[PDB]
Amino acid sequence: VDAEAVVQQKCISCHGGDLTGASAPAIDKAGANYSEEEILDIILNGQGGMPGGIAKGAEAEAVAAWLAEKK
Numbered sequence: 017v018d019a020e021a022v023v024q025q026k027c028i029s030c031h032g033g034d035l036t037g038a039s040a041p042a043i044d045k046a047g048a049n050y051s052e053e054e055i056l057d058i059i060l061n062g063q064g065g066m067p068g069g070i071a072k073g074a075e076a077e078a079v080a081a082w083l084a085e086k087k
């Protein structure tokens with residue numbers, strides 16, 4: 017999976033093109049604040065104002081792993 021491309025396709029509408037926030041909060045340093053598993057849970061299931069189901073399976077996992085390293 018190409019995680020950066022999945023993020024550009026599905027996450028920037030709310031998180032901003034450079035992930036520094038737009039309508040929703042920044043996620044450009046999410047790995048500094050969340051573990052990979054916490055990030056995966058949020059992607060699959062949503063959290064607070066974020067809907068669940070935007071990414072699934074291996075795609076979600078690849079995105080979680082990629083963001084987990086951004087600090």
Ligand code: HEC
Pocket residue numbers: 023026027028029030031039040041042043046049050055058059063064065066067070071079083
């Ligand atoms: C890909 C499509 C996405 C990824 C990866 C993430 N999001 Fe979201 N998101 C949205 C809101 C309104 C929030 C705040 C909810 C809260 O944390 O109380 C979030 C939150 C996150 C978080 C956690 C907090 C942080 O800023 O790191 C992460 C790691 C995250 N999101 C990753 C809204 C939306 C949204 C609007 C409809 C979309 C398309 C996405 N989020 C998509 C992604």
